[PDB]
Design a protein around this ligand. Structure first.
Ligand SMILES: Nc1ncnc2c1ncn2[C@@H]1O[C@H](COP(=O)(O)OP(=O)(O)O)[C@@H](O)[C@H]1O
Ligand SMILES: Nc1ncnc2c1ncn2[C@@H]1O[C@H](COP(=O)(O)OP(=O)(O)O)[C@@H](O)[C@H]1O
Ligand SMILES: Nc1ncnc2c1ncn2[C@@H]1O[C@H](COP(=O)(O)OP(=O)(O)O)[C@@H](O)[C@H]1O
Ligand SMILES: [Mg+2]
Ligand SMILES: [Mg+2]
Ligand SMILES: [Mg+2]
Lengths: 155, 192, 344, 536, 518, 48
C-alpha cells in the first residue's frame, strides 16, 4: 500500500525478478486448482498474468466491480468469501452445476441456473419486453408484489 | 565561496545520528581552511563576481572574513573582470590551488567614504608591470538625465582626441572649410 | 432516407432502427417507436419498419374511437385479446418443414436496399457464413467485418479466416516474406520491447562495473524472451500491446512475420479461426497450442494492407472485406448483410 | 399544432426537408454543377485548375480526385462524388475524371426517364443488367498479350505509359518519363511477372532544377549531410572488395544505460575515476567493433553526441544522424543488408552493399541531400524528380504515381484494351441492339445508358474543338460497317481514327471499373427520396 | 444549385483568365524598373515593427509583399527557386514569364488560338532556343588566365545591376580572388560577410585569413607570432558525464570536498593533455567558464570562446588543420599553423586578424558602407555575384549578354517557324517577340528609344555578326568582346527554362477555386 | 519622452534621432547615418 517500487541491485536479481512473478503467481494457483474449482468471481480488476494461469485449467472469471453485486451472488451458492489468495476452505466452497452463455438480448450474458436439488435463494426473473419504459413500470410492479409478500411474515 | 555542491547531480545521505555533528563541523571547516589559506597569502581585499545557481559568499563565511579584517564585495559584472585585472594588474583566481602571492595586485588605500548617501570605493595608487593602464572618472549632477548627457558629451569629447591620435592633423572649424571648399569647387565648376 | 446530423455525418438508409437512431427524438410518446424498432432489430434484425407502420396504423385507427366515448381500456382489451389469436394463427400459417435440407430466406431479407439486385452472388457466400458456426454458440463477433473505402462491390470474395489492418509501419516490415507455404500462428500478449518490466522503474547501482552488467542483463532477458518465441517455430506473431522496433527486426532476419496494434475483439476472432489459444508468457509455450492454416498472402486492398488467413480444415470465422465507392455504400452492404445474416 | 409547441427531433427549426420531384432536381443539377468542372478537364486537350487551400497553399491539378478532395462543399450529392473519385484514385489510380462525368451522364439521362414516370428501381436494375452485359461483351473482344515475349511486352507498357503521362503536364519529357517509368518496373518485378509489390517504390520530389535534369538512381534519398563535414564528400570503395560494406544501427553512440530510470551512486573518488575510465573505454570499444567489422559508412537512427565525430573522422568513416525509422526500412531492402540492433551482435554478414555514396549542392544554400546508387539490379527504385516550381514537382509526383499504377494494372495477366473513345462507343451500340428485342418496360433504360456512354467521346469533341455529331456519326457508322472495334476519337489529330496504330491502350480492369462505380453510385442516388440536412 | 459553401469565390468564365493574366502583368510591371544597370531600387514598408528593407532582387521583393492572387504565387515560387538555384536572374524570369503570358493574351483574345497550341509552339520554340546556346557557347577551360579574365567580366555584369555600379571595378578583383581562393568549392556558406557601417563604400578589403567577431576573454595577449591552432567541439567545461543518472552518496561533506576536487583534477588532467601538443592558441565552440580559462595562463596558451558551429567549418579550412577531440592520442591528430595573430578594431567592435596561413580554402569579406540598408544591399549583391561565379567553375561554358543572347535565340526560333506551317507558327512567333522585349525594357530603363534601337540590333545580327549588342552608356551598338560583359551557360539555361515552364503553368488554367480563409 | 517611463535630455543628434520613432523609412535612414557617424568619427553627428 505504501510506495510499491522495484529495487534491483545487481544482474542476478534482474534475471530472477521476471521469472519470480511467474512462479509466484503459478504457485498460488496450484493450491486453488487442486481443490477442484472451475469458476472464480472476482471483485475488482484482474491482472493478465493471473488470468493466464486461470484459463490454463479452464477456470471461469467473472467481474463484479461493486459491493452489493458481489454479496448477492454468495447467497445463491451459499459461499463465505475470504480476501486471502490462499486455499478456499472446502466447507466454504459453493455449489453450482452449470454456467451457460447464450444470446437473449443480442449481448453476452452469463447464467447460473441451479436444479431442484440443492435449492438456492435470491432468484431473478427474466423480463422480456419491447419498450424500455414498460420494463420500468413492470419491474416496480414486481417490487410491489414482493413487498406484499413481506406483509405475511411480520403479523 | 559556498558550501560544497558540484554541478553534477548529488544527494547527501545521513545514516547515523552522530554524523550530523561531524558534517556541521566540516562545513564551517571547509570555509575556515580556505579562509586560513587566504591569511597565508596575506590578501587583504577580495572581489567576487556575480554568482549563478547559488550565493556568492555564504553568511557563515562572512564571520570568518569580517573578523580577519577582509573587505568583501560581491555582485560585480562579468565583463568588468577584464577591466579590474588590466588596471590593478591582478590575475584572476579560479581555484585555491592556483592562489598565490605573485598573481595578486597592490594598492596603498582602499577607502569607502560616506558622502551624500552614495557610497564610492576608490583605489589610490597603482604600481605593476603593465603597459596598458586604466582610467576611471565618476559623474555627479542633479538627476539621472543630466548624468546620461554628461556621459555622452564626454564621449563626443574623447572621440575628438581619438580622431587626432588616429589620423594626424586638423583643420580650423567655425564654418571655414565649407566656404573654402564651396569657393574652390565653384572656381572649377565653370571650367568643366 | 438521407439524414445529416449536426456534426455533418452523412448517412443513407432504409431501416427503422438506424433512421430513428440518428434522429434525436425529444418527444416522449414518439420514442416508443424508436424502442419498438430497436427491439425488433435486436431480437431479429429484420422487419423493423413493418413494426413501426403497424404501430402507426393501430394508433391512427384508435384516433376516432378516442374522439368517441370509447374508454382507453376497451381498445387495449381488443388488441391484447386479438393478438393472442394472431400468434396462434401464425403458428398454423407457418410450416413444420424438414425436407429438402437458407438460400431462399436470405434473398428476402436483403430486400428494400442495395444488395437485393446482387442477391445471386451475395447469397451464395452469405449462406456459408453461418454454416461455419456450430449449434448453440452462434457468436456474433466472429462475423465482424471492417470498412475499406475504395473499390467495387463486385470484386469481393469469400474468406475462410480473418483480415485485419496492421495500423502501423514497422522498421523491418518489408524484410519479412509475404508468402508462407505452411504457416503457424501463435497468439501473444506480452509486450515485446525494451521498457520497464512491471509498472515501476527504480534501479540502484553502486559499482560502475555492475552498471555495465545490469544493462547487458536487460539486453539478455529481452532476447531470452524473443528466443523462446523463436525456438517453437512461430512464424506469425500477434499481440494486443505494441511491439517495438527491437523485436520486429529480430524476427525480420530469419523470416518471421509479426504484427500488433489490434483490438481484443479482433484477437478473439483470431483464436477461433486458427483454433489455438492465448499465451501471455513465453516460457509456457508448447508446440500443440499453435494454430495452422493452408497458406498466407498479404494483398493490396484499397491502399491498405491486410493479413489474410484461409484454407483451414475447421474454421469458426467468416469475415469478408467490404469494398465500395462511397463510405455509405460499404455501410449499406454491411447493414444489409447484418440483417440477412440474423435471419439465416 | 393546437397551440402547443409541436416538436419531434432536436433542433427542429434548424434542419429542413425536401421530397417529391424537387428533391431529384437538386440531385441532378448538383451533379451537372460538378460535371461542368470535370467536363472541361477531361481528355488530352484538358486544362488544369487551381485549388486554394485555407492555409494559402495552392495545388495546380487536373485529376478529379485531388480537385474534389481539396474542394469545400455543402451539398451531400457532390460529397459522394468526392468519394467516388477518391475510390478510383486509391485502387486503380486511373479514370477519376471519367467516373465523375460518366456518373453524371447516367444521372443526366435518368432525369428524362423520371419525367416519363419510370420507377427508380427499374432504372437502377436496367443499368445493372446493361453494365454486366457490356462487361461480358468487352471481355470477349479484347485480346491477350501474354503470348508475346518480354521484348514486345515492354512496348505495351510504353503504349500505356505515354497514354497516362499525356493529359498531364510532364507531357514534354513524356517520352523519357515513359522509358523511366518502364525502367523502374524492370528492376522491381517478380520472375513470374505477377503480384509486384508497389510499396517498394516511394515518391520523392525536389524543388529546384529543370525537368531535363531528372534521371534514374537506385537508392535512398536522405535530406541531411554527413557528420562534421571535414572528410571528402564523395567516398569511394577500396581497390579489392565486394562493396562499401554499409552498416546500419538503431543504437546511439553512448555508454550502455538502462531503459528504466537509474541512480548510479559514486561514494568514493576511486570509483569516480573508474567512471572516467568506463566512459572512455566504451567509446574506444565501440569504434574498434565497427573497425573490425570493416564498415565504411554507418547509419545511426537515434543520433549521437560530438565526441564520436573525431573518432569517426580519423578512421575515414562517414556517418549521419537523425535518420528516421521509415528510411531504415528503405535502406535495408535497397542494399540487401540486415540492421543489427547492437555492436555485440555485429557481424560482417549483416552489412549491406552498394556502389558509391556522394552528395551535391543543387544550388547555393538549400540543403545537402544524400544520394545512393547501385551497381546492378535491386529490389528498390527511387524516382529522382526535379522541377522549376513547387506546384510543378508536386503535380509530377501524382502524375508519375498514376503512371506506375497503370503499369501495375498491366502486371495482371490478360487485361488490355484500346481506349480513345473506342471502349465507350463499342459498348454503346450493343446495348441499343439488345433493347430492340428485350424491349419490356426497360427499353428506354437501355437507351439512356447507351446515350450516356457516348458522352465521353462528345466530351473529347468539345475539348478538341471538333463537331460532336459528325464525330459520333462517323464512329457509329464505322462500327456498324466493320466489326473491328479499336477505332476511337483521336484528339491530337495525327490523322486516322484507327488506334492500335496510334498506340493508345488503357487497362481493361480500369475501363470496366468506370461503369461499375458510375452505375453503383447512380443506384444509390436514385434511392434517395427525403433529404434532411442540418445547419452548420 | 450552389454546391459550394458560404463565401466561396469561383470563376469559371473569361474573367478567370483575365484575373490570372492581369495578376502576372501587375507582378511583371512591378519589376520592369529593377532590370538593367540604370534600374531604380525599390523600398519595402513592413507591417510589423516598422522594419524597412531596401532590395533590388525580385525574389526578396515578391516574397516580402503580400499577394492573394494564385497567379502571383507562381511568379513568387519561380523567383524563389531561381534565387536558391543560381542566385541571379530572378527579375528576368519574372518579367519574361509575365511577357510570355502578355503576348499569349492577344492570341487568346484577338486571334483565338487554342491554349494547347500556344504551349505546343513554346515546346518547339524552347527546344530551338536551347540549341542556339549549345553552339553560341564558348569553353575557356584550356587556359586559366582567360578563365581568370572571364570571372572579371561576369563580375562586371552581375555587380552593375546593384548599387555598386561605380565600385564594381574594385570588387571584381575582390570577387574573383574569393573564387580562386575556394578553388572549386561552390558552397556559399564558407564566406563570412562582416557588416560594418561607416566609412567610404570603396574601403572594403579581402584579408588572407579568417576574421573573428569576438575577442580574447580576460588576459590573453593581442599580438603573438608562430601560433599553433587547435579546434575542439566537446564540452571541455564542467564535464557532465553522458549518463545523467549519476549521483554521489555522500556520507560526510569532507568527502564531497574531495569529489569537487576530483572534478577539478580531471579538468586539470584534461588541460594537461592539451599542453602535450605544445600549442599557443586553443579554440572551442562552447563558451569557456572561469576554471579552465585560468589554467591556460600558466601554459602560455590563448583561449577563444563561444564560436558558432558554422564558423568552426570556416575556421578549420582557413587554418588548414583539423578539429581534435579525445586528446589522448596526439600522434594521429592534426593541427594547423599560422604566422602572426593580432587583434584589430574596425569601428566599435574589436576583431581578431589572422594572416599568413598555409591553407587558403576559405576567406572573409569586410564590407564598409554608409547605412545598414546600403550595407545590406551590398551583401545581397555580393552573394548574387559570388553565387554566379561559384557555379561558373563547375559550368565553364559562358554566353555573351547585352541583348545578344536573347536575339541569337530569336534568330534560330524564327528560322524554325517556317518549317512548322499551320497555326502553330503564330505561337512560335509569339515566343520570339517575347524575347525581343528583354532588350526593350533594358533600353526603356535608361531612357532610350524602344523601336529604333531594337531595330538596329535586329539588322546587325542577320547580316552575319553574332557579337553585336546594346551599349547603354552611349546609346548605340557596340562589340561585346571589347566591352567585356558575359554570363554563364547555367544562368541563361535556367532563365529560359524557368520562364518557359512558368508560362506553361498559367496557360493551362481556366477555373479558379477559392475556399474560405482560415 | 519615450514610450516607457524613462525621460532623457539629448543634444546629440544621434541620440535625438535614435529615440524619435519615425514612420517614414527614408527619414529613418538618417538614424543609421548618425549611428555610422557616431561609430566611425564620433563627432558631428548632426552636421552629416
Ligand atoms: N495521347 C492520347 N491520344 C488519344 N487519347 C488519349 C490520349 N491521352 C488520353 N487519351 C484519352 O483521354 C481520356 C481521358 O483520360 P484522362 O482524363 O486524361 O485520364 P484520367 O481520367 O485518369 O485523368 C481517356 O479515355 C483516354 O483514352
Ligand atoms: N555596362 C553595360 N553595358 C551593356 N549591358 C549591360 C551593362 N550592364 C548591365 N548590362 C545588361 O543588363 C543586364 C542586367 O541583368 P540583371 O539586372 O543582372 O538581371 P537580374 O537582376 O534578374 O539577375 C545584363 O543582362 C547585362 O547584359
Ligand atoms: N567655440 C565655438 N565658436 C564658434 N563655433 C564653434 C565653436 N565650437 C564649435 N563650433 C562650430 O559648431 C559646430 C558644432 O558641432 P557639434 O554640435 O559638435 O556636432 P555634434 O554635436 O554632432 O558633434 C562645429 O562644426 C563647429 O564648426
Ligand atoms: Mg428488411
Ligand atoms: Mg489518366
Ligand atoms: Mg542580376
Amino acid at each position: 500500500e505504501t510506495k510499491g517500487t522495484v529495487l534491483l541491485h545487481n544482474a542476478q536479481e534482474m534475471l530472477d525478478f521476471s521469472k519470480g512473478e511467474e512462479k509466484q503467481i503459478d504457485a498460488m494457483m496450484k493450491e486453488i486448482a487442486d481443490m477442484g474449482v472451475e469458476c472464480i468471481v472476482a471483485g475488482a480488476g484482474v491482472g493478465e498474468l493471473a488470468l493466464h494461469y486461470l484459463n490454463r485449467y479452464g477456470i471461469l472469471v467473472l467481474k463484479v466491480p461493486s459491493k452489493f453485486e458481489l454479496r448477492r451472488l454468495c447467497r445463491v451458492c451459499g459461499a463465505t468469501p475470504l480476501p486471502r489468495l490462499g486455499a478456499p476452505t472446502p466447507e466454504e466452497l459453493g455449489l453450482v452445476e452449470t454456467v451457460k452463455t447464450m444470446e437473449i438480448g443480442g449481448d453476452r450474458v452469463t447464467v447460473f441456473k441451479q436444479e431442484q436439488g440443492e435449492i438456492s435463494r435470491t432468484s431473478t426473473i427474466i423480463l422480456r419486453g419491447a419498450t424500455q419504459n414498460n420494463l420500468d413500470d413492470i419491474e416496480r410492479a414486481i417490487d410491489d408484489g414482493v413487498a406484499a409478500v413481506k406483509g405475511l411474515m411480520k403479523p | 565561496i559556498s558550501p560544497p555542491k558540484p554541478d553534477t547531480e548529488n544527494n547527501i545521505i545521513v545514516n547515523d545520528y552522530r554524523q550530523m555533528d561531524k558534517i556541521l563541523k566540516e562545513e564551517r571547516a571547509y570555509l575556515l581552511n580556505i579562509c586560513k589559506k587566504i591569511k597565508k597569502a596575506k590578501c587583504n581585499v577580495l572581489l567576487i563576481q556575480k554568482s549563478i545557481l547559488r550565493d556568492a559568499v555564504n553568511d557563515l563565511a562572512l564571520h570568518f572574513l569580517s573578523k580577519l579584517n577582509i573587505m568583501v564585495v560581491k555582485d560585480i559584472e562579468r565583463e568588468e573582470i577584464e577591466f579590474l585585472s588590466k588596471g590593478l594588474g591582478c590575475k584572476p583566481i579560479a581555484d585555491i590551488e592556483l592562489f598565490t602571492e605573485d598573481r595578486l595586485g597592490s594598492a596603498d588605500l582602499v577607502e569607502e567614504i560616506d558622502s551624500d548617501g552614495s557610497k564610492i570605493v576608490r583605489v589610490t595608487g597603482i604600481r605593476n608591470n603593465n603597459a596598458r593602464p586604466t582610467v576611471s572618472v565618476v559623474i555627479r549632477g542633479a538627476n539621472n538625465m543630466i548624468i546620461d548627457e554628461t556621459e555622452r558629451s564626454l564621449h563626443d569629447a574623447l572621440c575628438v582626441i581619438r580622431c587626432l591620435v588616429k589620423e594626424r592633423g586638423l583643420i580650423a572649424g567655425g564654418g571655414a572649410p565649407e566656404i573654402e571648399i564651396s569657393r574652390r569647387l565653384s572656381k572649377e565648376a565653370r571650367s568643366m | 432516407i438521407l439524414i445529416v446530423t449536426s456534426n455533418q455525418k452523412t448517412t443513407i438508409s432504409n431501416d427503422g432502427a438506424t433512421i430513428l437512431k440518428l434522429l434525436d427524438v425529444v418527444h416522449p410518446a414518439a420514442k416508443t417507436l424508436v424502442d419498438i424498432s430497436r427491439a425488433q432489430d435486436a431480437e431479429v434484425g429484420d422487419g423493423t419498419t413493418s413494426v413501426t407502420i403497424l404501430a402507426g396504423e393501430l394508433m391512427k385507427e384508435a384516433k376516432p374511437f378516442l374522439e368517441e366515448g370509447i374508454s382507453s381500456h376497451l381498445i387495449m382489451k381488443g388488441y391484447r385479446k386479438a393478438v393472442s389469436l394472431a400468434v396462434e394463427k401464425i403458428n398454423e400459417l407457418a410450416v413444420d418443414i424438414t425436407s429438402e435440407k437458407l438460400e431462399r430466406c436470405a434473398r428476402t431479407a436483403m430486400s428494400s436496399k442495395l444488395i437485393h439486385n446482387n442477391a445471386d452472388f451475395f447469397v451464395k457466400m452469405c449462406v456459408d457464413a453461418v454454416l461455419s458456426l456450430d449449434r448453440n454458440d452462434l457468436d456474433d463477433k466472429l462475423i465482424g467485418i471492417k470498412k475499406i473505402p475504395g473499390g467495387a462491390m463486385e470484386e469481393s470474395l469469400f474468406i475462410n479466416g480473418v483480415a485485419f489492418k496492421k495500423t502501423f509501419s514497422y522498421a523491418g516490415f518489408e524484410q519479412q516474406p509475404k508468402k508462407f507455404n505452411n504457416p503457424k500462428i501463435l497468439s501473444l500478449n506480452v509486450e515485446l520491447e525494451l521498457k520497464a518490466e512491471k509498472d515501476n522503474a527504480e534501479v540502484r547501482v553502486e559499482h560502475v562495473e555492475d552498471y555495465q552488467a545490469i544493462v547487458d542483463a536487460e539486453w539478455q532477458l529481452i532476447f531470452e524472451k524473443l528466443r523462446q518465441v523463436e525456438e517453437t517455430g512461430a512464424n506469425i506473431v500477434l499481440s494486443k500491446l505494441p511491439i517495438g522496433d527491437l523485436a520486429t527486426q529480430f524476427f525480420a532476419d530469419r523470416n518471421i512475420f509479426c504484427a500488433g496494434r489490434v483490438s481484443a475483439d479482433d484477437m478473439n476472432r483470431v483464436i477461433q479461426a486458427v483454433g489455438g489459444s492465448i499465451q501471455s508468457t513465453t516460457s509456457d509455450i508448447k508446440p500443440e497450442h499453435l494454430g495452422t492454416c493452408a497458406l498466407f498472402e498479404e494483398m493490396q486492398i484499397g491502399s491498405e494492407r491486410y493479413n489474410l488467413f484461409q484454407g483451414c480444415p475447421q474454421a469458426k470465422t467468416c469475415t469478408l472485406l467490404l469494398r465500395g465507392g462511397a463510405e455509405q455504400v460499404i455501410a449499406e452492404v454491411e447493414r444489409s448483410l447484418h440483417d440477412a445474416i440474423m435471419i439465416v | 399544432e393546437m397551440g402547443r409547441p409541436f416538436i419531434i427531433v432536436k433542433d427542429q427549426g434548424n434542419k429542413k426537408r425536401q421530397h417529391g420531384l424537387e428533391a431529384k432536381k437538386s440531385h441532378i443539377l448538383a451533379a451537372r454543377s460538378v460535371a461542368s468542372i470535370i467536363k472541361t478537364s477531361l481528355g488530352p486537350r484538358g486544362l488544369d485548375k487551381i485549388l486554394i487551400s485555407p492555409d494559402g497553399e495552392i495545388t495546380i491539378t487536373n485529376d478529379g480526385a485531388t480537385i474534389l478532395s481539396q474542394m469545400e462543399l455543402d451539398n451531400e450529392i457532390a460529397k459522394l462524388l468526392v468519394q467516388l473519385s477518391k475510390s478510383q484514385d486509391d485502387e486503380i489510380g486511373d479514370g477519376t475524371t471519367g467516373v465523375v462525368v460518366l456518373a453524371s451522364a447516367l444521372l443526366d439521362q435518368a432525369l428524362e426517364l423520371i419525367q416519363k414516370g419510370i420507377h427508380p428501381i427499374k432504372i437502377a436494375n436496367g443499368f445493372d443488367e446493361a453494365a454486366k452485359l457490356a462487361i461480358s461483351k468487352l471481355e470477349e473482344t479484347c485480346d491477350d498479350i501474354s503470348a508475346s515475349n518480354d521484348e514486345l511486352f515492354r512496348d505495351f507498357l510504353l503504349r500505356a505509359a505515354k497514354t497516362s503521362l499525356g493529359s498531364k503536364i510532364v507531357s514534354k519529357d513524356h517520352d523519357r518519363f515513359a522509358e523511366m517509368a518502364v525502367e523502374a518496373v524492370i528492376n522491381v518485378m517478380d520472375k513470374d511477372r505477377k503480384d509486384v509489390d508497389f510499396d517498394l517504390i516511394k515518391m520523392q520530389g525536389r524543388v529546384g532544377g529543370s525537368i531535363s535534369d531528372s534521371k534514374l538512381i537506385n537508392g535512398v534519398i536522405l535530406d541531411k549531410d554527413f557528420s562534421h563535414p571535414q572528410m571528402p564528400k564523395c567516398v569511394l570503395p577500396k581497390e579489392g572488395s565486394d562493396g562499401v560494406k554499409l552498416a546500419i544501427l538503431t543504437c546511439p553512440f553512448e555508454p550502455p544505460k538502462p531503459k528504466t530510470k537509474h541512480k548510479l551512486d559514486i561514494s568514493s573518488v576511486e570509483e569516480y575515476q573508474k567512471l572516467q575510465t568506463y566512459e572512455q573505454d566504451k567509446f574506444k570499444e565501440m569504434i574498434d567493433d565497427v573497425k573490425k567489422a570493416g564498415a565504411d559508412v554507418v547509419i545511426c537512427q537515434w543520433g549521437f553526441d560530438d565526441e564520436a565525430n573525431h573518432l569517426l573522422l580519423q578512421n575515414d568513416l562517414p556517418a549521419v544522424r537523425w535518420v528516421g525509422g521509415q528510411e531504415l526500412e528503405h535502406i535495408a531492402i535497397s542494399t540487401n543488408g540486415r540492421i543489427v540492433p547492437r555492436f555485440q551482435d555485429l557481424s560482417k554478414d549483416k552489412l549491406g552493399t552498394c556502389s558509391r555514396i556522394y552528395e551535391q549542392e543543387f544550388g547555393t544554400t538549400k540543403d545537402r541531400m544524400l544520394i545512393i546508387e547501385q551497381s546492378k539490379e535491386t529490389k528498390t527504385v527511387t524516382c529522382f524528380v526535379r522541377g522549376s516550381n513547387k506546384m510543378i514537382v508536386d503535380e509530377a509526383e501524382r502524375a508519375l504515381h498514376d503512371s506506375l499504377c497503370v503499369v501495375r494494372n498491366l502486371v495482371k495477366d490478360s487485361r488490355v484494351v484500346y481506349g480513345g473513345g473506342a471502349a465507350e462507343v463499342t459498348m454503346s451500340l450493343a446495348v441499343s441492339e439488345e433493347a430492340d428485342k428485350q424491349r419490356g418496360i426497360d427499353q428506354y433504360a437501355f437507351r439512356g445508358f447507351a446515350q450516356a456512354l457516348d458522352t465521353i467521346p462528345m466530351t473529347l469533341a468539345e475539348n478538341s474543338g471538333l463537331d460532336p455529331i459528325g464525330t459520333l456519326s462517323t464512329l457509329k457508322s464505322k462500327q456498324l460497317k466493320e466489326k473491328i472495334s479499336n477505332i476511337g476519337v483521336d484528339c491530337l489529330g495525327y490523322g486516322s481514327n484507327d488506334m492500335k496504330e496510334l498506340f493508345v491502350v488503357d487497362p481493361f480492369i480500369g475501363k470496366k471499373q468506370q461503369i461499375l462505380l458510375a452505375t453503383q453510385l447512380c443506384r444509390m442516388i436514385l434511392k434517395i427520396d427525403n433529404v434532411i440536412i442540418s445547419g452548420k | 444549385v450552389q454546391i459550394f459553401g458560404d463565401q466561396v469565390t469561383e470563376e469559371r468564365a473569361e474573367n478567370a483568365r483575365l484575373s490570372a493574366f492581369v495578376g502576372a502583368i501587375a507582378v511583371g510591371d512591378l519589376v520592369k524598373s529593377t532590370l538593367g544597370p540604370k534600374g531604380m531600387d525599390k523600398l519595402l514598408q513592413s507591417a510589423s515593427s516598422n522594419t524597412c528593407m531596401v532590395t533590388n532582387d525580385g525574389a526578396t521583393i515578391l516574397k516580402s509583399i503580400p499577394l492573394d492572387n494564385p497567379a502571383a504565387k507562381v511568379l513568387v515560387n519561380i523567383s524563389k527557386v531561381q534565387d536558391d538555384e543560381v542566385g541571379d536572374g530572378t527579375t528576368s524570369v519574372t518579367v519574361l514569364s509575365a511577357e510570355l503570358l502578355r503576348e499569349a493574351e492577344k492570341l487568346i483574345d484577338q486571334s483565338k488560338i487554342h491554349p494547347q497550341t500556344i504551349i505546343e509552339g513554346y515546346r518547339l520554340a524552347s527546344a530551338a532556343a536551347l540549341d542556339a546556346l549549345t553552339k553560341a557557347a564558348v569553353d575557356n577551360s584550356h587556359d586559366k588566365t582567360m578563365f581568370r579574365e572571364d570571372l572579371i567580366h561576369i563580375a562586371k555584369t552581375t555587380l552593375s545591376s546593384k548599387i555598386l555600379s561605380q565600385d564594381k571595378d574594385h570588387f571584381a578583383e575582390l570577387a574573383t580572388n574569393a573564387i580562386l581562393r575556394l578553388k572549386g568549392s561552390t558552397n556559399l556558406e564558407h564566406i563570412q560577410i562582416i557588416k560594418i557601417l561607416g566609412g567610404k563604400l570603396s574601403d572594403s578589403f579581402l584579408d588572407e585569413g579568417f576574421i573573428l567577431a569576438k575577442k580574447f576573454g580576460n588576459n590573453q595577449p593581442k599580438r603573438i607570432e608562430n601560433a599553433k591552432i587547435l579546434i575542439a567541439n566537446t564540452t571541455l567545461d564542467t564535464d557532465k558525464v553522458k549518463i545523467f543518472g549519476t549521483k554521489f552518496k555522500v556520507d560526510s561533506t569532507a568527502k564531497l570536498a574531495q569529489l569537487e576536487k576530483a572534478e577539478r583534477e580531471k579538468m586539470k588532467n584534461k588541460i594537461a593533455k592539451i599542453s602535450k601538443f605544445g600549442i599557443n592558441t586553443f579554440i572551442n565552440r562552447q563558451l569557456i567558464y572561469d576554471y579552465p580559462e585560468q589554467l591556460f595562463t600558466d601554459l602560455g596558451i590563448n583561449s577563444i570562446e563561444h564560436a558558432d558551429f558554422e564558423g568552426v567549418e570556416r575556421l578549420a579550412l582557413v587554418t588548414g588543420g583539423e578539429v581534435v577531440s579525445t586528446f589522448d592520442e596526439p600522434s594521429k591528430c592534426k593541427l594547423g599553423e599560422c604566422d602572426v595573430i593580432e587583434e584589430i578594431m574596425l569601428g566599435e567592435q574589436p576583431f581578431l586578424k589572422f594572416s599568413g596561413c598555409k591553407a587558403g580554402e576559405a576567406c572573409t569579406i569586410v564590407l564598409r558602407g554608409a547605412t545598414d540598408q546600403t550595407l545590406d544591399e551590398a551583401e545581397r549583391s555580393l552573394h548574387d555575384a559570388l553565387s554566379v561565379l561559384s557555379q561558373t567553375t563547375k559550368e565553364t561554358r559562358t554566353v555573351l549578354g547585352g541583348g545578344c543572347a536573347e536575339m541569337v535565340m530569336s534568330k534560330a526560333v524564327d528560322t524554325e517557324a517556317q518549317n512548322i506551317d499551320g497555326k502553330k507558327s503564330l505561337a512560335v512567333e509569339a515566343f520570339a517577340r517575347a524575347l525581343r522585349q528583354l532588350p526593350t525594357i533594358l533600353a526603356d530603363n535608361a531612357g532610350f528609344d524602344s523601336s529604333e534601337l531594337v531595330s538596329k540590333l535586329r539588322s546587325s545580327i542577320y547580316n552575319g555578326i553574332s557579337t553585336s549588342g546594346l551599349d547603354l552608356n552611349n546609346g548605340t551598338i557596340a562589340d561585346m568582346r571589347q566591352l567585356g560583359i558575359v554570363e554563364s551557360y547555367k544562368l541563361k539555361r535556367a532563365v529560359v527554362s524557368s520562364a518557359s515552364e512558368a508560362a506553361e503553368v498559367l496557360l493551362r488554367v481556366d477555373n479558379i477555386i477559392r475556399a474560405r480563409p482560415r | 519622452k519615450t514610450s516607457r517611463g524613462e525621460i532623457i535630455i539629448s543634444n546629440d543628434g544621434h541620440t535625438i534621432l535614435k529615440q524619435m520613432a519615425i514612420l517614414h523609412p527614408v527619414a529613418r535612414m538618417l538614424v543609421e547615418v548618425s549611428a555610422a557617424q557616431d561609430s566611425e568619427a564620433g563627432d558631428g553627428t548632426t552636421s552629416v
